[PDB]
Amino acid sequence: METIAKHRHARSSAQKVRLVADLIRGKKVSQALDILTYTNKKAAVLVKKVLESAIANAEHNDGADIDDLKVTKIFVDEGPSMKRIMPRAKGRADRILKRTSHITVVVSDR
């Protein structure tokens, strides 16, 4: 059985989030949680919250027994960007991009 949780419009660049994503691709959830517990990155918190939500979804809606789940799929996409202005010397102006991302995690008893 497949269960999905998502986080959309997360405030972080996708390149920075992809580094944490592949640390847990294909692991059992029990060890993935404690791996995410001891990485000193901002994105680890977001990924951990998404993973816990997915586990809760799988346990409540569909069948139980979180003791046999694995991380089957996980990927990060790019969301919309916000544009701002930063002044530079001699009266020039520059464009600043504030990038976001979407996070998807799939867990499965199989």
Partner: peptide
Amino acid sequence: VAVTVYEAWRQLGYKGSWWWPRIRGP
């Protein structure tokens, strides 16, 4: 809340440089 708006500024530049000697001057 959760709705965002902005504008732009385009005054470009105001040349007048190259204060050093000419490349292949007289």
